[PDB]
């Protein structure tokens, strides 16, 4: 048992989200430009992902529109507060772009659903406070997507492979990295 770590930060009209590789999947897609990341116990990760997909599919079918990140975190918090006594061991992280105004959004939650919305970066895992300082040091306002890529890669590496997702208005690029 290692837990892993999930990281997200935003730039200029683009967002990024990264996890740790080496083994279970930690990042799931919830839409065209909406992603989630789960860290913690593996079985709880899988159960939470499946139930969230169930609820999201029913919602989108019933109302006939793409969901937005705020509604997604509200649904996740409502799902997590169901287990206030004997909770799931997960720490979700949400990153995506608005389906209409294309505005970046990042968020973080605890194991019972207490959201936190920032404007630079969020960090979850078993070593959040260790790499929080280096994330603060390396961040810069208004970076192009490439600079965002190197900054997030360095943050994950200096804190064992990583996987990085870059979300833009048009294309989504996925890369795998390794330190030599």
């Amino acid at each position: 048992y290692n837990g892993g770590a999930v990281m997200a930060m935003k730039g200029k009209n683009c967002v990024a989200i990264a996890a740790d590789r080496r083994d279970f999947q930690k990042i799931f897609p919830m839409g065209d430009r909406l992603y989630i990341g789960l860290a913690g116990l593996a079985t709880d990760v899988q159960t939470v992902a499946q139930r969230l997909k169930f609820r999201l599919n029913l919602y989108e079918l019933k109302e006939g529109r793409q969901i937005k990140p705020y509604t997604l975190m509200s649904m996740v918090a409502n799902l997590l507060y169901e287990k206030r006594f004997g909770p799931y061991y997960t720490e979700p992280v949400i990153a995506g772009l608005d389906p209409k105004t294309f505005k970046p959004f990042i968020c973080s939650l605890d194991l019972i659903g207490c959201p936190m919305v920032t404007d630079d970066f969020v960090v979850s895992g078993t070593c959040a406070e260790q790499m929080y300082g280096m994330c603060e040091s390396l961040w810069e306002p208004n970076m192009d997507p490439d600079h965002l890529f190197e900054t997030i890669s360095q943050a994950m590496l200096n804190a064992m492979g990583v996987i990085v997702h870059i979300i833009e208005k048009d294309k989504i690029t996925t890369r795998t990295l390794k330190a030599r």
Binding site: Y1, G3, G40, Y81, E82, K83, R84, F85, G86, P87, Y88, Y89, T90, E91, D110, L111, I112, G113, C114, T126
Partner: protein, 214 residues
């Protein structure tokens, strides 16, 4: 259709992961690992009753909204505070829509007390409640186990001792609004600062209630 279902399901809290977590935590502590913890808030809060209103203060927002004339502050577990405040706000909005007039402080106090007593103190949420209605200004103090207490000034949080000492030293019945604001600011600083002022002059009790914006 599932072949193992006989009766329709219901809603509410779920106790499925109780025993599993109970043994898992013991095993992880025995082998020395770490598990996610619950976010907590411990910043000091205060409040005072001046001539014709209530002044609430907090340190860095953290002042919840329950009604146009009722506000609350919380300390303890953040999720429990948020959930309790939202539920009470929704119930009071329904009550005001039905009755056609602004609610009362005692109603919110009673609802919160009965909820917290129902859940046997497992929902940790210590609150400072204050507001003004037709009868006049009121201020309460609620505790996680469901016991309320009505006072002219209260303090909660880590640095509540200095604030309580300042209130004991420099409190006077029926003071002016500026004096109350200065006293609250000084008491909070003795332990930025946010202040909420609910005054009788900004509320009309002779007009039908209309839904506000949020």
């Amino acid at each position: 259709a599932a072949v193992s279902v006989y009766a329709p399901p219901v809603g509410g809290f779920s106790f499925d992961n109780c025993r599993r977590n109970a043994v898992l935590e013991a095993d992880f502590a025995k082998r020395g690992y770490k598990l996610p913890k619950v976010r907590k808030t411990g910043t000091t809060i205060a409040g005072v009753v001046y001539k014709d209103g209530i002044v609430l203060g907090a340190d860095t927002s953290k002042i919840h909204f329950i009604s146009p004339n009722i506000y609350c502050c919380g300390a303890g577990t953040a999720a429990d505070t948020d959930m309790t405040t939202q539920l009470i706000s929704s119930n009071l909005e329904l009550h005001s829509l039905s009755t056609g007039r602004l609610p009362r402080v005692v109603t919110a106090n009673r609802m919160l007390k009965q909820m917290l007593f129902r859940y046997q103190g497992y929902i940790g949420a210590a609150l400072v409640l204050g507001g003004v209605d037709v009868t006049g200004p009121h201020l309460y103090s609620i505790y996680p186990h469901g016991s309320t207490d009505k006072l002219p000034y209260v303090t909660m949080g880590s640095g509540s001792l200095a604030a309580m000492a300042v209130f004991e030293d420099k409190f006077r019945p029926d003071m002016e609004e500026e004096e109350a604001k200065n006293l609250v600011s000084e008491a909070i600083a003795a332990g930025n600062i946010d202040l909420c002022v609910i005054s009788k002059n900004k509320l009309d009790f002779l007009r039908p209630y209309t839904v506000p914006n949020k």
